Design a protein around this motif. Sequence first.
Motif, PDB file in Angstrom:
ATOM      1  N   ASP D   3      80.210  44.032  14.258  1.00  0.00           N
ATOM      2  CA  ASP D   3      78.855  43.524  14.103  1.00  0.00           C
ATOM      3  C   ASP D   3      77.876  44.596  14.565  1.00  0.00           C
ATOM      4  O   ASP D   3      78.267  45.626  15.120  1.00  0.00           O
ATOM      5  N   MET D   4      76.591  44.346  14.328  1.00  0.00           N
ATOM      6  CA  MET D   4      75.522  45.263  14.691  1.00  0.00           C
ATOM      7  C   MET D   4      74.526  44.550  15.593  1.00  0.00           C
ATOM      8  O   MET D   4      74.152  43.402  15.334  1.00  0.00           O
ATOM      9  N   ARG D   5      74.097  45.234  16.650  1.00  0.00           N
ATOM     10  CA  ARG D   5      73.174  44.659  17.615  1.00  0.00           C
ATOM     11  C   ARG D   5      72.204  45.736  18.079  1.00  0.00           C
ATOM     12  O   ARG D   5      72.465  46.934  17.947  1.00  0.00           O
ATOM     13  N   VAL D   6      71.072  45.298  18.619  1.00  0.00           N
ATOM     14  CA  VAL D   6      70.045  46.201  19.129  1.00  0.00           C
ATOM     15  C   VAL D   6      70.252  46.378  20.625  1.00  0.00           C
ATOM     16  O   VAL D   6      70.625  45.432  21.332  1.00  0.00           O
ATOM     17  N   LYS D   8      68.212  47.986  24.050  1.00  0.00           N
ATOM     18  CA  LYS D   8      66.877  48.358  24.512  1.00  0.00           C
ATOM     19  C   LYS D   8      66.978  48.862  25.948  1.00  0.00           C
ATOM     20  O   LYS D   8      67.093  48.068  26.887  1.00  0.00           O
ATOM     21  N   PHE D   9      66.936  50.185  26.114  1.00  0.00           N
ATOM     22  CA  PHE D   9      66.948  50.771  27.449  1.00  0.00           C
ATOM     23  C   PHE D   9      65.544  50.829  28.039  1.00  0.00           C
ATOM     24  O   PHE D   9      65.349  50.523  29.221  1.00  0.00           O
ATOM     25  N   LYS D  12      59.903  51.448  24.819  1.00  0.00           N
ATOM     26  CA  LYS D  12      59.701  52.240  23.613  1.00  0.00           C
ATOM     27  C   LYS D  12      60.974  52.941  23.152  1.00  0.00           C
ATOM     28  O   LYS D  12      60.903  53.831  22.299  1.00  0.00           O
ATOM     29  N   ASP D  13      62.129  52.564  23.694  1.00  0.00           N
ATOM     30  CA  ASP D  13      63.413  53.170  23.344  1.00  0.00           C
ATOM     31  C   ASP D  13      64.340  52.069  22.843  1.00  0.00           C
ATOM     32  O   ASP D  13      64.977  51.373  23.640  1.00  0.00           O
ATOM     33  N   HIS D  14      64.420  51.916  21.525  1.00  0.00           N
ATOM     34  CA  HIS D  14      65.301  50.945  20.896  1.00  0.00           C
ATOM     35  C   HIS D  14      66.269  51.667  19.973  1.00  0.00           C
ATOM     36  O   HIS D  14      65.880  52.581  19.240  1.00  0.00           O
ATOM     37  N   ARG D  15      67.533  51.256  20.018  1.00  0.00           N
ATOM     38  CA  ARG D  15      68.571  51.785  19.149  1.00  0.00           C
ATOM     39  C   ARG D  15      69.410  50.631  18.621  1.00  0.00           C
ATOM     40  O   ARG D  15      69.359  49.510  19.133  1.00  0.00           O
ATOM     41  N   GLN D  16      70.192  50.915  17.586  1.00  0.00           N
ATOM     42  CA  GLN D  16      71.093  49.935  16.993  1.00  0.00           C
ATOM     43  C   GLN D  16      72.527  50.381  17.241  1.00  0.00           C
ATOM     44  O   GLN D  16      73.028  51.288  16.568  1.00  0.00           O
ATOM     45  N   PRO D  39      77.363  53.072  20.495  1.00  0.00           N
ATOM     46  CA  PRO D  39      76.553  53.622  19.395  1.00  0.00           C
ATOM     47  C   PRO D  39      77.292  53.759  18.076  1.00  0.00           C
ATOM     48  O   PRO D  39      76.682  53.565  17.018  1.00  0.00           O
ATOM     49  N   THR D  41      81.182  53.452  15.636  1.00  0.00           N
ATOM     50  CA  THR D  41      82.368  52.626  15.437  1.00  0.00           C
ATOM     51  C   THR D  41      83.533  53.105  16.291  1.00  0.00           C
ATOM     52  O   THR D  41      84.244  52.293  16.894  1.00  0.00           O
ATOM     53  N   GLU D  43      83.456  54.841  19.131  1.00  0.00           N
ATOM     54  CA  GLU D  43      83.189  54.552  20.535  1.00  0.00           C
ATOM     55  C   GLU D  43      83.339  53.066  20.830  1.00  0.00           C
ATOM     56  O   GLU D  43      83.873  52.685  21.877  1.00  0.00           O
TER      57      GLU D  43
END
Lengths: 274, 100, 207, 49, 291
Positions: D3-6, D8-9, D12-16, D39, D41, D43
């Motif tokens: 699955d894919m999730r967001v 948030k560290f 203004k720093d968001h990654r998927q 980050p 597959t 890993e």
Amino acid sequence: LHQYPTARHKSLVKDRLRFARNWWLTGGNNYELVHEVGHEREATECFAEYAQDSSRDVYLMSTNRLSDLPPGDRLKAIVGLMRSRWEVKDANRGYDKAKLLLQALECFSEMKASGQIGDFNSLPEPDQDTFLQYVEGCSRFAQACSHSHPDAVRVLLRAAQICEEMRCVEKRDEMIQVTEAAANRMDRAYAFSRPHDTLPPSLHENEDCVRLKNTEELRRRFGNTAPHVLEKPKRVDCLRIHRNRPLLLHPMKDNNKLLELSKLPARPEFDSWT
Amino acid sequence: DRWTHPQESNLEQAARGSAVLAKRLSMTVSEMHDRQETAENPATLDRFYYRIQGPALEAGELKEALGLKGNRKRLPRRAPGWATLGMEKVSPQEPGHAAK
Amino acid sequence: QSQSSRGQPGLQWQEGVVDPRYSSSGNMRRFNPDTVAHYVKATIQNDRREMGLGEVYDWHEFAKDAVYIPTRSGPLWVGSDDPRCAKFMRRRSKMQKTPQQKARPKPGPDPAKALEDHPLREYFTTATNLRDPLSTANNLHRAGLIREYDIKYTAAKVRYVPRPPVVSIMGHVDHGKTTLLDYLRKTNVASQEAGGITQNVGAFQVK
Amino acid sequence: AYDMRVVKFSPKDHRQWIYCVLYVGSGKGIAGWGRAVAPSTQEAKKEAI
Amino acid sequence: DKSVFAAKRRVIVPIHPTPNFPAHFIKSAFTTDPLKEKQKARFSSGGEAMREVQDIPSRRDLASRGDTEFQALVEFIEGASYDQLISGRRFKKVYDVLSENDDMFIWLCHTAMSVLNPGDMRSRLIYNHLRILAESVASGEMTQRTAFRFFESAVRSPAYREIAKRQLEGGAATRLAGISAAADVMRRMGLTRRPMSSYFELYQRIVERSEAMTPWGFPPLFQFEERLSLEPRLKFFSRASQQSLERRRRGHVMTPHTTLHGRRIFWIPPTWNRAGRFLGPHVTLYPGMTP
RNA sequence: UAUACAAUUAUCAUAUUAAAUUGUUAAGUGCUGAUUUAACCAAUAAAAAUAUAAAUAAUUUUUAUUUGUUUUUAAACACCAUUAGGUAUAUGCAAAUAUAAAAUUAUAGUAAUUAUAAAUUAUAUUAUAUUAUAUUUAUUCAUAUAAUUAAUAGGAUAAUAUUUGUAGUUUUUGAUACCAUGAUAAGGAUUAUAAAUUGAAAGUGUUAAUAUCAUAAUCAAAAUUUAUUAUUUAUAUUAAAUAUGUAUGUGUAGAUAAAAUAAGAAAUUAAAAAGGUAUUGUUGCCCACCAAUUUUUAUAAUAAAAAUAACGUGCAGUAAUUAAUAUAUUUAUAAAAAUAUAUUUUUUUUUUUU
Ligand SMILES: [Mg+2]
Ligand SMILES: [Mg+2]
């Protein structure tokens, strides 16, 4: 009263955790790992073959008459035609099937010389079997249709000729025998052959006569003195209901006021009383 | 299967194998013996950590140009049968054509 | 973009009269400057003014290229040059250039040859020929009175027997045809006929 | 599953990142499940394992 | 953002196929191919490398390892030579190598002090319990919290409280035996190369903590590893507990612009593309005079 | 179309073992008069203070009955008026959130689930403490003109070429007088003394893919109306490319510019908390009304309910511009608003016998 985002799907708007709304990727401390490994066996072993290939590329042109095709393709065309021909239900007697089998046999005869396939012994077992099955089917159909079409003897003779040029002695002798038999058996079925012989009602047909006799004998007996010859009426008609139980509309009894009220005019002031 | 192991072309597979062969040949016998890098083990071509900062769409275009990410390449369709080369040229799946 | 509204369709006609909205004169999809108020024209001008567009010199000519968009508020009258109607104008221009743009399936083999190949083809029967004995013998076999082996024998053995003649009284209207038939039948049925004319084919046996 | 999730560290720093759930099993009677987010597959698979 | 997807809306261009970024494969698998390597291998091979390269420099690894802490320290020390500077990364590496074994010291100090009445450490039963748990912690096979629970709940003697009523009035036993056992276990087990380091750490982490409020009282959550923890400087028995490092520095009005105008050591050097006007970190625009 | 809630804790009307009810006090000038409020304001203005010990937990509450409208001195006080005042406090009429429940909406038929949660988002230093800020100087600011951009071709002192003088019209179409993707600038507020620099990346006319009448270009002697520019002030004044005729008016209104770096300037200062109903993320969701199509219940000149991307009037709600929630009253273009009473899914600021 129902909120609904028109631009985007409601589920896509709602699933905040699954996607990321921000579109700016910042460095920060977001390291990504690029790991690449390989093995020596990948250089040669286990290579796939793509579906599209120029070797298996064909430009398919079409023509209607069989003579355009070579005998090799003409045999497949004839078999494809016979695939749809053999579904016809005619008690396995006919002339078109014999003609198609004769065409296939002629294809074999042509391919013997032009197609350089060789001789019967040169041809391996499976195609020998196919040829024998085709010639046997042609013989059977020609025999079946011989009494009607007098050209089945010619069909059998051509089959025997094709067997001769294919150099199959065992089948050729049988073809000679069957042609000799049919050439004399074809005229037997006709009328002139058997002048000695000449040329029954069904159960329903006879019962119709019985019913007619009963109706006539009741007609002359009671047609004038007492008209009781009428059969029992079936005016009541069954209508289908919930569980397909047939409901029958029983006629109303005379001893009730419903029919007396019904027979009167609806509006006495305006409707005629006569 | 298709997520964990991305599909790649035969040319890429051959390139990876040739790179491994080149690395093995360039290595010396003494260091190969020290590292236990015999022909059975797979060689690690490269490994690095990168950091990218920028807009998402332009970063995607950049990564596709650099070959860092795939997931959108239209690889050629594989053969319906056994796709591996070297198979028998004529082999019907159904034997058929039986007598008697 | 889509000319159809998002509500359920309604009845086009009243008891006997057509609904004015769907009538050709009062078409709901046509912009009629005569019957519309001043505020709709004001909105059209304001829309053409806020966005860079040419002003409407003539409304009767503008109505020809005016485009109707159904909205929850109501009709939206827009110009053919407008960006909102640009996509629909693209599709309409492509249609006016070439209508045939939807893939069509390949037809199969000719149905006549399909009938020749049909499984039930041999069960067909044709009308017997009066002067042909083979036809009636074959039809005897088809109806199951004789054997297919005996078709030829019956074709040779079939006899011909005369039948009572059938004559058709034909002619113009009001030319005594029914009266002639009545006198032949020794009856009087022309008088009781509804309308004094024959309207159905009648076959009667006479001596 | 994958699955894919967001993630948030920073505001203004968001990654998927992607989320991998798996398990390891052996019919000798030993099994264990895991789920992780990472980050990439590879890993995610390694962390889940 | 300037991409194909964004440009399709920004300005519709009928020429959809357009390479925005030229292809340049940074990876190693894509660049090479068998045809290239067939030619490359003859010129560059292992034998050729051995022929044309000079020699400038488990059991074999241990033989060549030597002293890891000393080998790490000498790098930072030798960073003071004329051709290199005092790198902070070297000190970070030395600190990590020195403090890699601090977890076992923390656990041993917790077992020595937090346990109110461990019993008689001289007794071989309790000594074996402590030794086994310390070995498990050092190997990592058991976490510190569970090891401490095992130590404090291990079987010692029947009627333990009744027996302790004879000796301890308040339930607090002398720590000399506990410290002696905690030193003896690390002396016997080859934890660290230097035998005295274990004893010195065990003694120092106790004598330094002894002068703090509630010296032997620890909250259950923060006493060991947990999801929520404390700062490394604020840990209980940490080696960096006491510090007075500079935390306030004066800043002028031009600081956000001159962040990189000082004697900064650049991880990435500024270029003309990024910085329009910046001479460099080594220049001095107002030099003095020296003899 | 048939095919297995819960029973250990469920926020909208299911109250049923509970001690209540009643006290008889307070406050009483007219004096030469500016009280209240963001502002206006109205007419004597001061006032109503007493408790506990005591009523069984039950086997028919099956049973009476009961839950902040409750009528008069002052102070409060909603419709309406606009120069600015009127207008509500348990004696009766009134079962009622403290919950024995079956996905949203809806009369228990209308749509296809509905709500809710977490993270993040620019408003609030605190008073020794990571710096004394506080002085000097300055301000009438103006210039642009006469059209053609699409090839290579060698020579004296060299072993020889007239190649001295090298001669094939006409099928393409954008940086041009719009538009015709990207890219550098200006803009000082907290990483400081020390062997040291007081100028930023968030973008400034010219630059690398969208075309479809485009000859706009200095080689002199030329035409202020345009935001973004330090000019010489009263002894001696026009000679070389041609080079400024205007405005003397108490160092003079408003408005405004610059500097704490080889210059000279010194005690009160940075350093808390505190939010999304928005995810298209305030240029956002959302609200009724207006407007347009249409469906269901209905046949009664009915009523009610539901679906819908663009209109019109607004800005009601979303820490959201005088807080919000619940009930009652009232007003009406519409969200709603104001009062009476009861609440906070309103973000919060220290008094253990002075
Ligand atoms: Mg007639
Ligand atoms: Mg508001």
